[PDB]
Amino acid sequence: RTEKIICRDVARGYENVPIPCVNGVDGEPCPEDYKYISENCETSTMNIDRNITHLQHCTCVDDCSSSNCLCGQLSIRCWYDKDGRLLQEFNKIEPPLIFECNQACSCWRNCKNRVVQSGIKVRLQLYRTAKMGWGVRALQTIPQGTFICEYVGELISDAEADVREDDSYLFDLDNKDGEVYCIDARYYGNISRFINHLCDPNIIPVRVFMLHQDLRFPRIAFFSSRDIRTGEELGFDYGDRFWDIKSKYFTCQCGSEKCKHSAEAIALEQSRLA
Amino acid sequence: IRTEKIICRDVARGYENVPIPCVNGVDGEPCPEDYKYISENCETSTMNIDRNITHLQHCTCVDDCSSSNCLCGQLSIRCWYDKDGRLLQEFEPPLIFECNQACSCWRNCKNRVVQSGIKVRLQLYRTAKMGWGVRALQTIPQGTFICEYVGELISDAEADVREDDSYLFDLDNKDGEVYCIDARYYGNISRFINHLCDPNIIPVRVFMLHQDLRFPRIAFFSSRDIRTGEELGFDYGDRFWDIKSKYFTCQCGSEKCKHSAEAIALEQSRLAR
Ligand SMILES: Cc1c(C(=O)N[C@@H](CCC2CC2)C(=O)Nc2ccc(C#N)cc2)[nH]c2c1C(=O)CC(C)(C)C2
Ligand SMILES: Cc1c(C(=O)N[C@@H](CCC2CC2)C(=O)Nc2ccc(C#N)cc2)[nH]c2c1C(=O)CC(C)(C)C2
Ligand SMILES: Nc1ncnc2c1ncn2[C@@H]1O[C@H](C[C@@H](N)CC[C@H](N)C(=O)O)[C@@H](O)[C@H]1O
Ligand SMILES: Nc1ncnc2c1ncn2[C@@H]1O[C@H](C[C@@H](N)CC[C@H](N)C(=O)O)[C@@H](O)[C@H]1O
Ligand SMILES: [Zn+2]
Ligand SMILES: [Zn+2]
Ligand SMILES: [Zn+2]
Ligand SMILES: [Zn+2]
Ligand SMILES: [Zn+2]
Ligand SMILES: [Zn+2]
Ligand SMILES: [Zn+2]
Ligand SMILES: [Zn+2]
């Protein structure tokens, strides 16, 4: 079947680049059972602290590439290299919080510590996969450590998440201390709502602070964990919490030799304990 | 002969769509730094703007929002944008409702002028008699968006007690409590726009990515064709000058000046008759 292009830009011009949609698998048209938003939204108010006097900020008179940058120190160091990519030694299993520079800092808008707030730069495509519904793939090579996109949706409380019927787009912010919040991309979301789980993932989520530092509401940034080839599907590890629940209802279709959540893998992890 | 020096390549530090340089060919005054340049309004207490996406009025247009059927255009009061993004008015103050994240239209539709930011080239420069001012670096057709009045959102009760009121902009909320934008400590290029009795820009209230009626945003549009080099200015209003004329008079130098010593005396002469 021909790979028809069915939307020139699912983001309707809201991103720095278009995100087209194609389907060469079945007759499903472009997905429209949600509202594309490029930045997080609220229905009920979350009362995010946006008091500018509450911000920690730097006093740098350079490009914030020195070890003197107070915003880099809020994460030990600035984990961005000169090209805006995560460093090699960056912890990819236990990422630190990133504090980017903000409107209170003395530095310029193009300092070295503003990667996520500058938006999508790589060419992505929404496409129909063979076995996992819609997915997202790269239309270019992407070096390791490159910012891909943010997990964008509706900010909700943990209590609201628990009464939501469809949890297939629910991202837990993992607030360890105090009030717990989630991003639900079911009704409002961006391209990230279509990114599938891979047991051999090529992107990782990182918690980032930009225009506010209300620690209840980290923003979720995906960075590539290795070099990604053109045409390669993007995916992150949804985590054992997700699969511990969902695997009762469906198993992983990633098809990797390393797959941890397939029907075969589940049967092995069960036949063992027996 | 004193030469003009470029003393800052961009007072906005890269936050605007274009750089806004500062020059001084008048005196020894250094680039103004007794404030924090911000490109968007800030808060220093709980304002918590209502951004509930489900409560935004929005349109369903599948075109570029150029038709009269666009709900957002229909909500706008006594004004509209032409095909080039220029504001036309009837001349009750105008009120603009731009399209937003809830509308079905694209980010580049015809009802997105103010939210797309500064497009005209402006310069902060030292004036002869009015301190710093802002002038055009290009021809600006009538109705063109110039810049937004940006600063610290405060309640009118807080505005009543601020010590330096030289940068205080009253939003004049009709229904509900009144709020103000104070650009004294945090502000953008607009904090430097002087009063002119022959003004060439006008402030217009606008809603964009929220419709929290406490906080219209203030957008300046040209009220006539402006030539390169002309100082930009708006009418600060009689309420400003009724109070401030005790302390200083208007130095705009226009033959139409309303607030010089001579104009005030003449107005007092007219009232006495
Ligand atoms: C992967 C991850 C998450 C996360 O929420 N995943 C989602 C899966 C992906 C969403 C796109 C769906 C998840 O588990 N949903 C979920 C769980 C249970 C039920 C039920 N019944 C329903 C839905 N939260 C953090 C991570 C991290 O890697 C690190 C962190 C600090 C950013 C914190
Ligand atoms: C001009 C204007 C305003 C406005 O606040 N001006 C400022 C002057 C300019 C600021 C850049 C300084 C103003 O008066 N300050 C002020 C008044 C009294 C005292 C004392 N003691 C101190 C300071 N507010 C609207 C307008 C309009 O034209 C229409 C509107 C609907 C947008 C509503
Ligand atoms: N590895 C996977 N194996 C099977 N199904 C998956 C896998 N990854 C994602 N999915 C499906 O996609 C859902 C998660 C969505 N956030 C991803 C986009 C989804 N594919 C869609 O078409 O809307 C899951 O709840 C599954 O239904
Ligand atoms: N027409 C005017 N005549 C005299 N002073 C003016 C005039 N317009 C503005 N000013 C001065 O500028 C102040 C308002 C500021 N928002 C404008 C920028 C100011 N010129 C500065 O250098 O910072 C007023 O309180 C006056 O001190
Ligand atoms: Zn810094
Ligand atoms: Zn910086
Ligand atoms: Zn900083
Ligand atoms: Zn798998
Ligand atoms: Zn419309
Ligand atoms: Zn609209
Ligand atoms: Zn529109
Ligand atoms: Zn005057």
PDB file of N, CA, C and O in Angstrom, chain A residues 8-9 12-14 35-37 39 41-48 50-53 102-110 114 117 188, chain B residues 8-10 13-15 36-38 42-46 48-54 100-108 112 115 186 209:
ATOM      1  N   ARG A   8      -0.084  17.568   6.551  1.00  0.00           N
ATOM      2  CA  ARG A   8       1.205  18.219   6.357  1.00  0.00           C
ATOM      3  C   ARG A   8       1.859  18.568   7.684  1.00  0.00           C
ATOM      4  O   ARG A   8       3.089  18.590   7.775  1.00  0.00           O
ATOM      5  N   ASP A   9       1.060  18.825   8.724  1.00  0.00           N
ATOM      6  CA  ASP A   9       1.608  19.240  10.013  1.00  0.00           C
ATOM      7  C   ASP A   9       0.524  19.033  11.071  1.00  0.00           C
ATOM      8  O   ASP A   9      -0.395  19.849  11.177  1.00  0.00           O
ATOM      9  N   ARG A  12      -0.144  22.090  13.344  1.00  0.00           N
ATOM     10  CA  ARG A  12      -0.807  23.300  12.849  1.00  0.00           C
ATOM     11  C   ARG A  12       0.092  24.530  12.977  1.00  0.00           C
ATOM     12  O   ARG A  12      -0.365  25.623  13.312  1.00  0.00           O
ATOM     13  N   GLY A  13       1.387  24.349  12.734  1.00  0.00           N
ATOM     14  CA  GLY A  13       2.307  25.471  12.743  1.00  0.00           C
ATOM     15  C   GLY A  13       2.795  25.903  14.110  1.00  0.00           C
ATOM     16  O   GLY A  13       3.532  26.905  14.198  1.00  0.00           O
ATOM     17  N   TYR A  14       2.417  25.193  15.182  1.00  0.00           N
ATOM     18  CA  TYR A  14       2.808  25.609  16.525  1.00  0.00           C
ATOM     19  C   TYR A  14       4.230  25.222  16.902  1.00  0.00           C
ATOM     20  O   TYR A  14       4.750  25.764  17.883  1.00  0.00           O
ATOM     21  N   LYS A  35      -6.728  17.100  21.037  1.00  0.00           N
ATOM     22  CA  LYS A  35      -6.424  18.464  20.629  1.00  0.00           C
ATOM     23  C   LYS A  35      -4.920  18.660  20.736  1.00  0.00           C
ATOM     24  O   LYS A  35      -4.359  18.507  21.824  1.00  0.00           O
ATOM     25  N   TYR A  36      -4.267  18.960  19.614  1.00  0.00           N
ATOM     26  CA  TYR A  36      -2.822  19.168  19.649  1.00  0.00           C
ATOM     27  C   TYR A  36      -2.524  20.505  20.306  1.00  0.00           C
ATOM     28  O   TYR A  36      -3.027  21.549  19.874  1.00  0.00           O
ATOM     29  N   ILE A  37      -1.689  20.470  21.337  1.00  0.00           N
ATOM     30  CA  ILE A  37      -1.163  21.674  21.972  1.00  0.00           C
ATOM     31  C   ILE A  37       0.350  21.554  22.031  1.00  0.00           C
ATOM     32  O   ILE A  37       0.885  20.469  22.272  1.00  0.00           O
ATOM     33  N   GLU A  39       2.323  23.343  24.205  1.00  0.00           N
ATOM     34  CA  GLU A  39       2.782  23.568  25.571  1.00  0.00           C
ATOM     35  C   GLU A  39       1.722  23.056  26.529  1.00  0.00           C
ATOM     36  O   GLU A  39       0.542  22.962  26.181  1.00  0.00           O
ATOM     37  N   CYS A  41      -1.105  22.446  29.233  1.00  0.00           N
ATOM     38  CA  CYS A  41      -2.303  23.217  29.531  1.00  0.00           C
ATOM     39  C   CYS A  41      -2.836  22.826  30.900  1.00  0.00           C
ATOM     40  O   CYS A  41      -2.408  21.839  31.505  1.00  0.00           O
ATOM     41  N   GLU A  42      -3.788  23.616  31.372  1.00  0.00           N
ATOM     42  CA  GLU A  42      -4.568  23.297  32.552  1.00  0.00           C
ATOM     43  C   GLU A  42      -6.035  23.316  32.164  1.00  0.00           C
ATOM     44  O   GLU A  42      -6.459  24.137  31.342  1.00  0.00           O
ATOM     45  N   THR A  43      -6.797  22.391  32.729  1.00  0.00           N
ATOM     46  CA  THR A  43      -8.218  22.661  32.856  1.00  0.00           C
ATOM     47  C   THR A  43      -8.399  23.281  34.242  1.00  0.00           C
ATOM     48  O   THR A  43      -8.317  24.511  34.376  1.00  0.00           O
ATOM     49  N   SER A  44      -8.529  22.468  35.283  1.00  0.00           N
ATOM     50  CA  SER A  44      -8.551  23.002  36.641  1.00  0.00           C
ATOM     51  C   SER A  44      -7.194  23.627  36.952  1.00  0.00           C
ATOM     52  O   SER A  44      -6.153  23.153  36.489  1.00  0.00           O
ATOM     53  N   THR A  45      -7.187  24.711  37.723  1.00  0.00           N
ATOM     54  CA  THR A  45      -5.906  25.371  37.941  1.00  0.00           C
ATOM     55  C   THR A  45      -5.034  24.582  38.914  1.00  0.00           C
ATOM     56  O   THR A  45      -5.517  23.997  39.893  1.00  0.00           O
ATOM     57  N   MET A  46      -3.739  24.536  38.603  1.00  0.00           N
ATOM     58  CA  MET A  46      -2.741  23.885  39.436  1.00  0.00           C
ATOM     59  C   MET A  46      -2.050  24.858  40.373  1.00  0.00           C
ATOM     60  O   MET A  46      -1.267  24.417  41.218  1.00  0.00           O
ATOM     61  N   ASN A  47      -2.318  26.158  40.228  1.00  0.00           N
ATOM     62  CA  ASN A  47      -1.694  27.193  41.044  1.00  0.00           C
ATOM     63  C   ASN A  47      -0.173  27.093  40.997  1.00  0.00           C
ATOM     64  O   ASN A  47       0.506  27.031  42.025  1.00  0.00           O
ATOM     65  N   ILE A  48       0.359  27.050  39.781  1.00  0.00           N
ATOM     66  CA  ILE A  48       1.800  26.974  39.603  1.00  0.00           C
ATOM     67  C   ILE A  48       2.414  28.270  40.105  1.00  0.00           C
ATOM     68  O   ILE A  48       1.931  29.363  39.786  1.00  0.00           O
ATOM     69  N   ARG A  50       4.505  31.156  39.885  1.00  0.00           N
ATOM     70  CA  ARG A  50       5.184  31.917  38.842  1.00  0.00           C
ATOM     71  C   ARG A  50       5.692  33.254  39.354  1.00  0.00           C
ATOM     72  O   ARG A  50       5.926  34.174  38.562  1.00  0.00           O
ATOM     73  N   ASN A  51       5.856  33.385  40.662  1.00  0.00           N
ATOM     74  CA  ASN A  51       6.405  34.609  41.242  1.00  0.00           C
ATOM     75  C   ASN A  51       7.866  34.728  40.825  1.00  0.00           C
ATOM     76  O   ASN A  51       8.702  33.917  41.229  1.00  0.00           O
ATOM     77  N   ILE A  52       8.184  35.755  40.028  1.00  0.00           N
ATOM     78  CA  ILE A  52       9.531  35.887  39.474  1.00  0.00           C
ATOM     79  C   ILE A  52      10.578  36.040  40.570  1.00  0.00           C
ATOM     80  O   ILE A  52      11.735  35.645  40.383  1.00  0.00           O
ATOM     81  N   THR A  53      10.202  36.611  41.721  1.00  0.00           N
ATOM     82  CA  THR A  53      11.143  36.736  42.834  1.00  0.00           C
ATOM     83  C   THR A  53      11.447  35.398  43.497  1.00  0.00           C
ATOM     84  O   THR A  53      12.384  35.321  44.300  1.00  0.00           O
ATOM     85  N   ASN A 102      16.490  31.416  32.742  1.00  0.00           N
ATOM     86  CA  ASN A 102      15.128  31.919  32.754  1.00  0.00           C
ATOM     87  C   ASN A 102      15.160  33.439  32.648  1.00  0.00           C
ATOM     88  O   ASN A 102      16.221  34.063  32.525  1.00  0.00           O
ATOM     89  N   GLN A 103      13.968  34.032  32.702  1.00  0.00           N
ATOM     90  CA  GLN A 103      13.817  35.468  32.507  1.00  0.00           C
ATOM     91  C   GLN A 103      14.409  36.276  33.651  1.00  0.00           C
ATOM     92  O   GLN A 103      14.616  37.484  33.492  1.00  0.00           O
ATOM     93  N   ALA A 104      14.706  35.649  34.790  1.00  0.00           N
ATOM     94  CA  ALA A 104      15.365  36.371  35.875  1.00  0.00           C
ATOM     95  C   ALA A 104      16.885  36.394  35.759  1.00  0.00           C
ATOM     96  O   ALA A 104      17.525  37.244  36.394  1.00  0.00           O
ATOM     97  N   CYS A 105      17.482  35.502  34.973  1.00  0.00           N
ATOM     98  CA  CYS A 105      18.932  35.504  34.834  1.00  0.00           C
ATOM     99  C   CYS A 105      19.413  36.744  34.086  1.00  0.00           C
ATOM    100  O   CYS A 105      18.694  37.337  33.273  1.00  0.00           O
ATOM    101  N   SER A 106      20.658  37.127  34.359  1.00  0.00           N
ATOM    102  CA  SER A 106      21.263  38.270  33.689  1.00  0.00           C
ATOM    103  C   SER A 106      21.735  37.949  32.278  1.00  0.00           C
ATOM    104  O   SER A 106      22.067  38.880  31.529  1.00  0.00           O
ATOM    105  N   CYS A 107      21.754  36.672  31.898  1.00  0.00           N
ATOM    106  CA  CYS A 107      22.343  36.231  30.648  1.00  0.00           C
ATOM    107  C   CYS A 107      21.383  36.467  29.486  1.00  0.00           C
ATOM    108  O   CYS A 107      20.221  36.850  29.666  1.00  0.00           O
ATOM    109  N   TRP A 108      21.877  36.203  28.277  1.00  0.00           N
ATOM    110  CA  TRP A 108      21.094  36.385  27.064  1.00  0.00           C
ATOM    111  C   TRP A 108      20.230  35.159  26.743  1.00  0.00           C
ATOM    112  O   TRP A 108      20.479  34.038  27.202  1.00  0.00           O
ATOM    113  N   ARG A 109      19.208  35.392  25.913  1.00  0.00           N
ATOM    114  CA  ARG A 109      18.268  34.340  25.532  1.00  0.00           C
ATOM    115  C   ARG A 109      18.940  33.208  24.765  1.00  0.00           C
ATOM    116  O   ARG A 109      18.401  32.096  24.710  1.00  0.00           O
ATOM    117  N   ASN A 110      20.108  33.444  24.183  1.00  0.00           N
ATOM    118  CA  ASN A 110      20.811  32.379  23.482  1.00  0.00           C
ATOM    119  C   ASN A 110      22.000  31.838  24.274  1.00  0.00           C
ATOM    120  O   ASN A 110      22.964  31.348  23.684  1.00  0.00           O
ATOM    121  N   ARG A 114      19.724  26.777  27.568  1.00  0.00           N
ATOM    122  CA  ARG A 114      18.330  27.041  27.199  1.00  0.00           C
ATOM    123  C   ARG A 114      17.830  26.091  26.107  1.00  0.00           C
ATOM    124  O   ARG A 114      17.026  26.472  25.247  1.00  0.00           O
ATOM    125  N   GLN A 117      13.824  24.934  26.279  1.00  0.00           N
ATOM    126  CA  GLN A 117      12.909  26.041  26.073  1.00  0.00           C
ATOM    127  C   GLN A 117      12.932  26.565  24.642  1.00  0.00           C
ATOM    128  O   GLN A 117      12.065  27.367  24.283  1.00  0.00           O
ATOM    129  N   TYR A 188      -5.625  16.542  25.456  1.00  0.00           N
ATOM    130  CA  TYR A 188      -4.759  17.605  24.963  1.00  0.00           C
ATOM    131  C   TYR A 188      -3.332  17.088  25.018  1.00  0.00           C
ATOM    132  O   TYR A 188      -2.879  16.648  26.078  1.00  0.00           O
TER     133      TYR A 188
ATOM    134  N   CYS B   8      24.612  49.835  23.302  1.00  0.00           N
ATOM    135  CA  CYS B   8      24.151  48.476  23.567  1.00  0.00           C
ATOM    136  C   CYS B   8      23.597  47.928  22.265  1.00  0.00           C
ATOM    137  O   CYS B   8      22.764  48.577  21.623  1.00  0.00           O
ATOM    138  N   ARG B   9      24.050  46.738  21.875  1.00  0.00           N
ATOM    139  CA  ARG B   9      23.571  46.147  20.629  1.00  0.00           C
ATOM    140  C   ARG B   9      22.139  45.646  20.758  1.00  0.00           C
ATOM    141  O   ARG B   9      21.411  45.588  19.761  1.00  0.00           O
ATOM    142  N   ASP B  10      21.706  45.299  21.971  1.00  0.00           N
ATOM    143  CA  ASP B  10      20.351  44.785  22.155  1.00  0.00           C
ATOM    144  C   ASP B  10      19.992  44.893  23.636  1.00  0.00           C
ATOM    145  O   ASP B  10      20.416  44.051  24.431  1.00  0.00           O
ATOM    146  N   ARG B  13      18.495  41.670  25.198  1.00  0.00           N
ATOM    147  CA  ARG B  13      19.333  40.493  25.426  1.00  0.00           C
ATOM    148  C   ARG B  13      18.861  39.279  24.629  1.00  0.00           C
ATOM    149  O   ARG B  13      18.937  38.153  25.115  1.00  0.00           O
ATOM    150  N   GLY B  14      18.368  39.489  23.411  1.00  0.00           N
ATOM    151  CA  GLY B  14      17.940  38.388  22.560  1.00  0.00           C
ATOM    152  C   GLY B  14      16.524  37.896  22.778  1.00  0.00           C
ATOM    153  O   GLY B  14      16.108  36.927  22.110  1.00  0.00           O
ATOM    154  N   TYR B  15      15.764  38.513  23.685  1.00  0.00           N
ATOM    155  CA  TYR B  15      14.422  38.023  23.975  1.00  0.00           C
ATOM    156  C   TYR B  15      13.372  38.448  22.954  1.00  0.00           C
ATOM    157  O   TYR B  15      12.295  37.852  22.932  1.00  0.00           O
ATOM    158  N   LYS B  36      14.993  45.518  35.108  1.00  0.00           N
ATOM    159  CA  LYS B  36      15.216  44.195  34.537  1.00  0.00           C
ATOM    160  C   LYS B  36      14.383  44.072  33.270  1.00  0.00           C
ATOM    161  O   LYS B  36      13.151  44.120  33.338  1.00  0.00           O
ATOM    162  N   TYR B  37      15.045  43.904  32.124  1.00  0.00           N
ATOM    163  CA  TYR B  37      14.311  43.751  30.874  1.00  0.00           C
ATOM    164  C   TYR B  37      13.634  42.391  30.862  1.00  0.00           C
ATOM    165  O   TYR B  37      14.300  41.360  31.008  1.00  0.00           O
ATOM    166  N   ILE B  38      12.316  42.393  30.679  1.00  0.00           N
ATOM    167  CA  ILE B  38      11.546  41.172  30.471  1.00  0.00           C
ATOM    168  C   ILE B  38      10.720  41.380  29.219  1.00  0.00           C
ATOM    169  O   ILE B  38      10.207  42.477  28.980  1.00  0.00           O
ATOM    170  N   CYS B  42       5.310  39.835  34.141  1.00  0.00           N
ATOM    171  CA  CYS B  42       5.636  38.970  35.268  1.00  0.00           C
ATOM    172  C   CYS B  42       4.727  39.268  36.451  1.00  0.00           C
ATOM    173  O   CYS B  42       3.998  40.257  36.471  1.00  0.00           O
ATOM    174  N   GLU B  43       4.787  38.399  37.464  1.00  0.00           N
ATOM    175  CA  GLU B  43       4.106  38.646  38.727  1.00  0.00           C
ATOM    176  C   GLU B  43       5.085  38.486  39.878  1.00  0.00           C
ATOM    177  O   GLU B  43       6.030  37.695  39.806  1.00  0.00           O
ATOM    178  N   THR B  44       4.860  39.272  40.932  1.00  0.00           N
ATOM    179  CA  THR B  44       5.646  39.202  42.157  1.00  0.00           C
ATOM    180  C   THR B  44       4.794  38.846  43.370  1.00  0.00           C
ATOM    181  O   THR B  44       5.248  38.991  44.505  1.00  0.00           O
ATOM    182  N   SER B  45       3.577  38.374  43.142  1.00  0.00           N
ATOM    183  CA  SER B  45       2.699  37.844  44.169  1.00  0.00           C
ATOM    184  C   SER B  45       1.768  36.885  43.445  1.00  0.00           C
ATOM    185  O   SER B  45       1.868  36.711  42.228  1.00  0.00           O
ATOM    186  N   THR B  46       0.853  36.253  44.177  1.00  0.00           N
ATOM    187  CA  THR B  46      -0.046  35.309  43.507  1.00  0.00           C
ATOM    188  C   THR B  46      -1.022  36.083  42.630  1.00  0.00           C
ATOM    189  O   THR B  46      -1.958  36.717  43.124  1.00  0.00           O
ATOM    190  N   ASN B  48      -1.806  34.135  39.504  1.00  0.00           N
ATOM    191  CA  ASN B  48      -2.346  32.879  38.974  1.00  0.00           C
ATOM    192  C   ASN B  48      -3.358  33.121  37.867  1.00  0.00           C
ATOM    193  O   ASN B  48      -4.564  32.913  38.048  1.00  0.00           O
ATOM    194  N   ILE B  49      -2.858  33.558  36.715  1.00  0.00           N
ATOM    195  CA  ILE B  49      -3.726  33.846  35.584  1.00  0.00           C
ATOM    196  C   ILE B  49      -4.564  32.619  35.257  1.00  0.00           C
ATOM    197  O   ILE B  49      -4.060  31.489  35.239  1.00  0.00           O
ATOM    198  N   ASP B  50      -5.859  32.832  35.030  1.00  0.00           N
ATOM    199  CA  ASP B  50      -6.753  31.737  34.659  1.00  0.00           C
ATOM    200  C   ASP B  50      -6.449  31.324  33.227  1.00  0.00           C
ATOM    201  O   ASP B  50      -6.747  32.061  32.284  1.00  0.00           O
ATOM    202  N   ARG B  51      -5.861  30.141  33.055  1.00  0.00           N
ATOM    203  CA  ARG B  51      -5.551  29.618  31.734  1.00  0.00           C
ATOM    204  C   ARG B  51      -6.335  28.354  31.404  1.00  0.00           C
ATOM    205  O   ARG B  51      -5.911  27.589  30.536  1.00  0.00           O
ATOM    206  N   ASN B  52      -7.471  28.128  32.071  1.00  0.00           N
ATOM    207  CA  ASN B  52      -8.291  26.946  31.820  1.00  0.00           C
ATOM    208  C   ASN B  52      -8.630  26.856  30.340  1.00  0.00           C
ATOM    209  O   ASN B  52      -9.431  27.646  29.828  1.00  0.00           O
ATOM    210  N   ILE B  53      -8.031  25.887  29.643  1.00  0.00           N
ATOM    211  CA  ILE B  53      -8.174  25.814  28.190  1.00  0.00           C
ATOM    212  C   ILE B  53      -9.613  25.556  27.773  1.00  0.00           C
ATOM    213  O   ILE B  53     -10.010  25.907  26.653  1.00  0.00           O
ATOM    214  N   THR B  54     -10.420  24.963  28.652  1.00  0.00           N
ATOM    215  CA  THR B  54     -11.797  24.655  28.288  1.00  0.00           C
ATOM    216  C   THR B  54     -12.701  25.871  28.357  1.00  0.00           C
ATOM    217  O   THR B  54     -13.821  25.819  27.835  1.00  0.00           O
ATOM    218  N   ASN B 100      -6.153  31.546  19.670  1.00  0.00           N
ATOM    219  CA  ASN B 100      -5.475  30.988  20.826  1.00  0.00           C
ATOM    220  C   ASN B 100      -5.293  29.485  20.621  1.00  0.00           C
ATOM    221  O   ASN B 100      -5.623  28.930  19.569  1.00  0.00           O
ATOM    222  N   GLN B 101      -4.740  28.832  21.641  1.00  0.00           N
ATOM    223  CA  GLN B 101      -4.415  27.412  21.591  1.00  0.00           C
ATOM    224  C   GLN B 101      -5.659  26.535  21.558  1.00  0.00           C
ATOM    225  O   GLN B 101      -5.546  25.337  21.265  1.00  0.00           O
ATOM    226  N   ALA B 102      -6.840  27.086  21.858  1.00  0.00           N
ATOM    227  CA  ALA B 102      -8.056  26.288  21.740  1.00  0.00           C
ATOM    228  C   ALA B 102      -8.682  26.342  20.353  1.00  0.00           C
ATOM    229  O   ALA B 102      -9.449  25.436  20.015  1.00  0.00           O
ATOM    230  N   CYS B 103      -8.367  27.360  19.551  1.00  0.00           N
ATOM    231  CA  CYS B 103      -8.931  27.474  18.207  1.00  0.00           C
ATOM    232  C   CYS B 103      -8.443  26.335  17.308  1.00  0.00           C
ATOM    233  O   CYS B 103      -7.353  25.786  17.490  1.00  0.00           O
ATOM    234  N   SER B 104      -9.254  25.998  16.305  1.00  0.00           N
ATOM    235  CA  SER B 104      -8.868  24.953  15.366  1.00  0.00           C
ATOM    236  C   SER B 104      -7.875  25.439  14.323  1.00  0.00           C
ATOM    237  O   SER B 104      -7.299  24.614  13.608  1.00  0.00           O
ATOM    238  N   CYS B 105      -7.655  26.752  14.232  1.00  0.00           N
ATOM    239  CA  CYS B 105      -6.857  27.324  13.162  1.00  0.00           C
ATOM    240  C   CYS B 105      -5.368  27.111  13.424  1.00  0.00           C
ATOM    241  O   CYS B 105      -4.950  26.619  14.478  1.00  0.00           O
ATOM    242  N   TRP B 106      -4.558  27.500  12.449  1.00  0.00           N
ATOM    243  CA  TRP B 106      -3.112  27.373  12.545  1.00  0.00           C
ATOM    244  C   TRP B 106      -2.492  28.581  13.248  1.00  0.00           C
ATOM    245  O   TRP B 106      -3.074  29.667  13.315  1.00  0.00           O
ATOM    246  N   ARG B 107      -1.281  28.369  13.772  1.00  0.00           N
ATOM    247  CA  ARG B 107      -0.547  29.406  14.488  1.00  0.00           C
ATOM    248  C   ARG B 107      -0.263  30.626  13.615  1.00  0.00           C
ATOM    249  O   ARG B 107       0.012  31.709  14.148  1.00  0.00           O
ATOM    250  N   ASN B 108      -0.333  30.485  12.294  1.00  0.00           N
ATOM    251  CA  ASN B 108      -0.064  31.592  11.386  1.00  0.00           C
ATOM    252  C   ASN B 108      -1.336  32.176  10.776  1.00  0.00           C
ATOM    253  O   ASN B 108      -1.276  32.770   9.696  1.00  0.00           O
ATOM    254  N   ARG B 112      -3.364  36.805  14.777  1.00  0.00           N
ATOM    255  CA  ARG B 112      -2.265  36.431  15.663  1.00  0.00           C
ATOM    256  C   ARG B 112      -1.204  37.518  15.725  1.00  0.00           C
ATOM    257  O   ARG B 112      -0.029  37.225  15.964  1.00  0.00           O
ATOM    258  N   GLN B 115       0.446  38.413  19.376  1.00  0.00           N
ATOM    259  CA  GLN B 115       1.143  37.283  19.970  1.00  0.00           C
ATOM    260  C   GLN B 115       2.371  36.870  19.164  1.00  0.00           C
ATOM    261  O   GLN B 115       3.197  36.109  19.671  1.00  0.00           O
ATOM    262  N   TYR B 186      10.644  45.815  36.427  1.00  0.00           N
ATOM    263  CA  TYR B 186      10.686  44.844  35.345  1.00  0.00           C
ATOM    264  C   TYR B 186       9.917  45.456  34.194  1.00  0.00           C
ATOM    265  O   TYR B 186       8.783  45.905  34.385  1.00  0.00           O
ATOM    266  N   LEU B 209      -3.475  34.198  24.740  1.00  0.00           N
ATOM    267  CA  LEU B 209      -3.439  32.809  25.198  1.00  0.00           C
ATOM    268  C   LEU B 209      -4.172  32.596  26.515  1.00  0.00           C
ATOM    269  O   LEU B 209      -4.151  31.480  27.062  1.00  0.00           O
TER     270      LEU B 209
END
